[PDB]
Amino acid sequence: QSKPWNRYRLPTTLLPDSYNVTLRPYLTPNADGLYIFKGKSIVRFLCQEPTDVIIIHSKKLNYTTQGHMVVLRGVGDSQVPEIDRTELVELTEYLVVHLKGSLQPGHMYEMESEFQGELADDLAGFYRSEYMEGNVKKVLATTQMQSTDARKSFPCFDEPAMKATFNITLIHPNNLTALSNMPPKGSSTPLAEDPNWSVTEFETTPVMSTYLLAYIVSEFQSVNETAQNGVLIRIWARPNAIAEGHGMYALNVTGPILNFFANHYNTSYPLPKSDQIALPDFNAGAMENWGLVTYRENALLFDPQSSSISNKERVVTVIAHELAHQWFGNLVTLAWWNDLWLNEGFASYVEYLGADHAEPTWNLKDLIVPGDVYRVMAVDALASSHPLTTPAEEVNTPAQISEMFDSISYSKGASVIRMLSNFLTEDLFKEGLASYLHAFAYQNTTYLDLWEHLQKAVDAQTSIRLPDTVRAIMDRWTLQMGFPVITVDTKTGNISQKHFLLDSESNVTRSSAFDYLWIVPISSIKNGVMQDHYWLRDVSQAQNDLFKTASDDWVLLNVNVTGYFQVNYDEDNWRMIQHQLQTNLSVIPVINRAQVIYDSFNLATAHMVPVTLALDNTLFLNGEKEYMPWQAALSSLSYFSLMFDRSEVYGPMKKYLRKQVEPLFQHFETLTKNWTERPENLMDQYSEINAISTACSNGLPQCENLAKTLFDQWMSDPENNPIHPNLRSTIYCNAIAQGGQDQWDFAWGQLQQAQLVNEADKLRSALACSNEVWLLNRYLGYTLNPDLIRKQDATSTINSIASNVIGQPLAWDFVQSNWKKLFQDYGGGSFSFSNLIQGVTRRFSSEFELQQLEQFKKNNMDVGFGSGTRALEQALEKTKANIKWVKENKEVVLNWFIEHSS
Ligand SMILES: *[C@@H]1O[C@H](CO)[C@@H](O[C@@H]2O[C@H](CO)[C@@H](O[C@@H]3O[C@H](CO)[C@@H](O)[C@H](O)[C@H]3NC(C)=O)[C@H](O)[C@H]2NC(C)=O)[C@H](O)[C@H]1NC(C)=O
Ligand SMILES: *[C@@H]1O[C@H](CO)[C@@H](O[C@@H]2O[C@H](CO)[C@@H](O[C@@H]3O[C@H](CO)[C@@H](O)[C@H](O)[C@H]3NC(C)=O)[C@H](O)[C@H]2NC(C)=O)[C@H](O)[C@H]1NC(C)=O
Ligand SMILES: *[C@@H]1O[C@H](CO)[C@@H](O[C@@H]2O[C@H](CO)[C@@H](O[C@@H]3O[C@H](CO)[C@@H](O)[C@H](O)[C@H]3NC(C)=O)[C@H](O)[C@H]2NC(C)=O)[C@H](O)[C@H]1NC(C)=O
Ligand SMILES: *[C@@H]1O[C@H](CO)[C@@H](O[C@@H]2O[C@H](CO)[C@@H](O)[C@H](O)[C@H]2NC(C)=O)[C@H](O)[C@H]1NC(C)=O
Ligand SMILES: *[C@@H]1O[C@H](CO)[C@@H](O[C@@H]2O[C@H](CO)[C@@H](O)[C@H](O)[C@H]2NC(C)=O)[C@H](O)[C@H]1NC(C)=O
Ligand SMILES: *[C@@H]1O[C@H](CO)[C@@H](O[C@@H]2O[C@H](CO)[C@@H](O)[C@H](O)[C@H]2NC(C)=O)[C@H](O)[C@H]1NC(C)=O
Ligand SMILES: *[C@@H]1O[C@H](CO)[C@@H](O[C@@H]2O[C@H](CO)[C@@H](O)[C@H](O)[C@H]2NC(C)=O)[C@H](O)[C@H]1NC(C)=O
Ligand SMILES: *[C@@H]1O[C@H](CO)[C@@H](O[C@@H]2O[C@H](CO)[C@@H](O)[C@H](O)[C@H]2NC(C)=O)[C@H](O)[C@H]1NC(C)=O
Ligand SMILES: *[C@@H]1O[C@H](CO)[C@@H](O[C@@H]2O[C@H](CO)[C@@H](O)[C@H](O)[C@H]2NC(C)=O)[C@H](O)[C@H]1NC(C)=O
Ligand SMILES: *[C@@H]1O[C@H](CO)[C@@H](O)[C@H](O)[C@H]1NC(C)=O
Ligand SMILES: *[C@@H]1O[C@H](CO)[C@@H](O)[C@H](O)[C@H]1NC(C)=O
Ligand SMILES: CC(C)C[C@H](N)C(=O)O
Ligand SMILES: [Zn+2]
Secondary structure: OOOHHHOOOOOOOEEEEEEEEEEEEOOOOOOOOOOEEEEEEEEEEEEOOOEEEEEEEOOOOEEOOOOOOEEEEEOOOOOOOOEEEEEEEOOOOEEEEEEEEEEOOOOEEEEEEEEEEEOOOOOOEEEEEEEEEOOEEEEEEEEEOOOOOHHHOOOEOOOOOOOEEEEEEEEEEOOOEEEEOOOEOOOOEEOOOOOOEEEEEEOOOOOEOHHHOOEEEEOOEEEEEEOOOOOEEEEEEOHHHHHHOOOHHHHHHHHHHHHHHHHHOOOOOOOOEEEEEEEOOOOOOEEOOOOEEEEEHHHHOOOOOOOOHHHHHHHHHHHHHHHHOOOEOOOEEEOOHHHHHHHHHHHHHHHHHHHHHHOOOOOHHHHHHHHHHHHHHHHHOOOOOOOOOOOHHHOOOHHHHHOOOOHHHHHHHHHHHHHHHHHHOHHHHHHHHHHHHHHHOOEEEOHHHHHHHHHHHHHOOOOOOOOOOHHHHHHHHHOOOOOEEEEEEOOOOEEEEEEOOOOOOOOOOOOOOOOOOOOEEEOEEEOOEEOOOEEEOOOOEEEOHHHOOOOOOOEEEOHHHOOOOEEEEOHHHHHHHHHHHHHHHHHOOHHHHHHHHHHHHHHHHOOOOOHHHHHHOOHHHHHOOOHHHHHHHHHHHHHHHHHHOOOOOHHHHHHHHHHHHHHHHHHHHHHOOOOOOOOOOHHHHHHHHHHHHHHHHHOOHHHHHHHHHHHHHHHOOOOOOOOOOOOHHHHHHHHHHHOOHHHHHHHHHHHHOOOOHHHHHHHHHHHOOOOOHHHHHHHHHHHOOOOOOOHHHHHHHHHHHHHOOOHHHHHHHHHHHOOOOHHHHOOOOOOOHHHHHHHHHOOOOOHHHHHHHHHHHOOOOOOOOHHHHHHHHHHHHHHHHHHHHHHHHHHHHHHHHHHHOO
16 A cells, blocks of 8 residues: 555545634745745544544645644544654645544544745735835735645645635734635734734635635725625725726626526525625636635726727626636535536636626627637647546646646537537526536535436426437537537438548547547528427438438528537538528528638638638628628638738738728728717627728728828827727737838837736737838847836737738747847746747748758757747647648639639
8 A cells, every 4th residue: 555645635534624724924025035924724624534644735834833733632522642743745745644543533623733835926825916006016915726725825625525614814914905705704903912913804604615715915995886685796906996997897797797697596696795806917817716706907907998898898708707606616616626627617608698697788698609619629629639527536636637727628618518508408407507506505516416417407397308318418528529520411411420630631549438429419500490400319420301402402500509510511502501691691690600611611621621612601701790700711711821921822812801801891981980989789899890900901991091090190199099999909000010110119109108908918019010120120129128028028029020921030030049048038937938939930831941940949959948848849840731731722722812802
């Protein structure tokens, strides 16, 4: 046998009941410049099986407990064994208490410790975050436990299923505010040892997981509202953020969203209050700590003067995401991190539901398709993907746990759960979900528990009939990786499925229980009229008349892309759809208008249609007003841009896109009353933004003139920006493209004095749009200087230059020459060498350029490559793919564009 303290998973001999935890951050450095925090904790736990060892998590804590590292007491009249010795096992992150005798089952024990750790700027555990308010560097103390960092703040049984109540006390400077999961018990009281400090005790948490604990000490302020049921809602942020009104949007939506979910889930919000807090530079994005949710500022705050509609969308959906967790994840928690996908996939899905409640005119639900479905299909159509489900026994280390937080888990998880809600109907899904939430409140589950409760709801009715059990169906989508292409020959109605890969030559080596066969829910529209629902069983091939067409009829599968699959047809059926989109596109749901574009470009890639068929599918766009189909086009073509914008192909391409987009431009010119007013709802605003970007970047004189007039106008009155935030990135970029140092210098001016991140970002990116070599080179020489350009912005800025066709060879030469600077900013930030290499080499598509990257690599001697060591490999391999793709495609594509651009 091996010793239990050398195993990554905790024993189950001891289960926690309740913790007292007192934390004291020191926000002034101890002058060798170390920031510390101090803590004291008591954990009460119950013995289940006799054991003579107590194993508890601890990470980067020094112990100052009197005696051994802990003190051990019996609860009530329980005797307690003596401690032999206490030791720290770093690898498995344990504090280990060896006893002279055994603990007894049924008995409770209390274990006290005193400790301290660094209050580091590391976004891990109890940590510090520094930021500026005017002249002053400010410093606050805040938490991020997710996933395995609670143990970094205090010793605890730090696994999600080992839930307990927590009594939190903060000791803090007496003019700072202290926040935790729960409301404060009463007024803070002064610390007897030193009254410059106060003591804030918090009400007992519900039974909960360690990874959801939070506590924060800052000078933040709040805007507040009391929902009618008395639930207090607060948005917390920097004093000046609050004073400028930047919390108001979050406050507006929060109440409705919470309300939506309590009714959605059929389960009262389980806490007396909900705080949400905007943190500067919170690189982890957002965290759903129960009752105190943390966001990065640009995820929670919104400035109506400067922020764009897409910023607005980000805020409402992120809030909805974090709030969804307050039932799903927090109230009912997955037993182990192998099932993370459920939790994050669920939030990643219902975020759209919650947000749509708050903004019911925006059609937000649609956005899951481009946002999650097609996003994750790009990576799930690879031989190198993985199942949603991982065996529990394979997820053990903190690193292994971290690896669970990826595309597949969030976006595929969202996609397959959306599929499941749709084939069950939402009302039925809701019932099973309510049943699951009530049965498991304050406890832990596996995905099998959700299947079961959905089955119960299925079994309790007669309307929805399935081809198999919920579990049997969802097993197809959770235990094997990837997804099928579904191919329909409409001449016969034959319908087949195969595992879909973008690379037609790939060897899949990961085996499946099911031979990569799925049970597939298939909706279909024929001549614009909904057909009966069909299930493809787990067979390669089948036949149904649902999919048989006459000559002048058409059929289209997967309405609204609710199903996690792509569709191909015979060529005839494609053409009819094409002609339908030509003559009355309204017959076909906007989402499917996009599907046709997304799928066919993917199929073309996989060599299952000719690329010209995919391009034909763009032809209808000249009469398309709606956001999504255009977005499908723009997303699928950006690679064609990457590959061809230095080639003879480009002129025909631009000319084609000018042709396609001009009417959309004209449409918005009228609609927006000469551009003075924005369109009403989100989708039409998104469309306007894309149409303007596309027009301008392709050289439509009408868009070029707009951008010049507007940027001219702004320069003649710098305090009154005439450019709506929706149009800013395009108008800036185009106008700087047309202009010289007059335009460039003014914008640089505006970068240096902008106080808002979203706006600085746009200026930084537009400045890279110059068409003067000398301006792009001078700009490059700024990117390293941290006076002029922040380091965290340095490689991003170099990539934006690379992105400019003229800046490509400039960036590339610059990176080569100052590569000697792994040994200066591998020492001063992480940097992301990996993202730089990717961005600057992504256009490479010739043998000559592959010779150049190979020739670059042979500075292997010293220097090295740090983070992008395998990012270079991926560069040399991606270039090989591009060379192959360009030789196969250059001619056919050139002539398609020549032909279709008047
Ligand atoms: C975890 O923290 C809890 C809160 O601090 C502890 O419970 C508190 O214990 C306090 C003293 O140990 C009690 O305060 C007062 O003590 C005086 C003695 O001077 C007594 O007369 C009273 O019982 C009490 N005063 C009043 C006004 O009630 C608190 O009663 C008590 N707080 C509670 C129960 O909410 C836990 O004991 C601590 N856990 C462990 C294991 O140490
Ligand atoms: C938890 O305990 C650790 C071990 O005692 C502490 O780590 C020690 O911190 C010292 C600085 O605080 C480190 O510096 C050494 O000592 C003095 C600084 O006061 C320097 O002059 C020496 O140059 C320096 N020695 C070296 C080799 O650089 C010690 O390095 C370090 N000891 C160890 C073993 O790591 C932690 O600070 C302590 N943390 C908290 C938050 O209490
Ligand atoms: C949180 O919700 C509030 C209430 O629903 C929103 O408050 C509305 O803000 C609107 C945007 O400025 C205001 O509407 C327009 O204001 C301009 C300014 O002079 C006028 O031209 C328009 O006529 C006017 N429109 C209307 C319908 O009045 C509203 O004054 C205001 N409505 C209310 C009830 O106060 C908040 O904007 C919203 N906060 C955020 C950040 O979204
Ligand atoms: C955290 O605080 C709570 C309540 O303030 C404590 O719960 C009490 O536990 C004691 C001893 O088990 C019981 O006598 C009371 O019934 C509990 N009160 C309530 C309201 O439940 C809890 O013990 C504290 N945790 C620790 C570790 O002390
Ligand atoms: C809380 O008290 C601290 C200490 O008096 C204040 O922090 C000082 O702020 C001034 C400028 O206002 C700085 O120049 C000092 O260096 C600060 N001292 C330290 C140790 O940081 C702080 O402003 C007060 N905060 C609030 C919200 O009132
Ligand atoms: C959870 O859903 C249940 C069951 O649908 C709700 O109870 C229903 O409430 C409506 C509202 O008036 C009544 O018309 C139904 O007759 C009720 N059904 C039953 C069985 O009581 C319940 O109120 C919801 N609870 C929460 C907390 O949202
Ligand atoms: C993890 O969750 C399970 C349930 O999913 C918990 O087991 C339940 O415990 C409660 C209270 O002890 C009982 O009412 C049920 O009968 C139990 N159901 C079971 C055992 O299947 C389990 O206690 C949780 N694990 C931990 C460590 O808390
Ligand atoms: C449609 O599906 C059926 C299979 O069920 C195919 O018809 C069979 O094809 C084999 C191939 O040699 C014949 O030998 C069988 O006699 C056929 N079975 C029949 C007619 O019942 C048919 O080829 C498919 N059509 C396609 C893919 O276009
Ligand atoms: C496909 O998606 C569209 C939205 O893009 C759905 O249309 C919405 O349906 C709801 C209720 O039927 C309406 O309240 C919305 O206002 C509709 N929006 C639009 C823009 O039409 C459509 O119902 C979906 N089709 C199917 C068959 O599920
Ligand atoms: C896949 O295996 C085939 C033969 O089974 C081989 O020709 C090919 O090189 C392999 N790999 C790729 C990535 O195509
Ligand atoms: C286009 O089809 C829509 C929906 O079927 C219909 O309402 C509209 O009248 C049609 N218009 C034309 C010109 O065919
Ligand atoms: C790393 C954590 C902040 C992740 C969080 N649960 C999210 O998905 O937003
Ligand atoms: Zn989440």
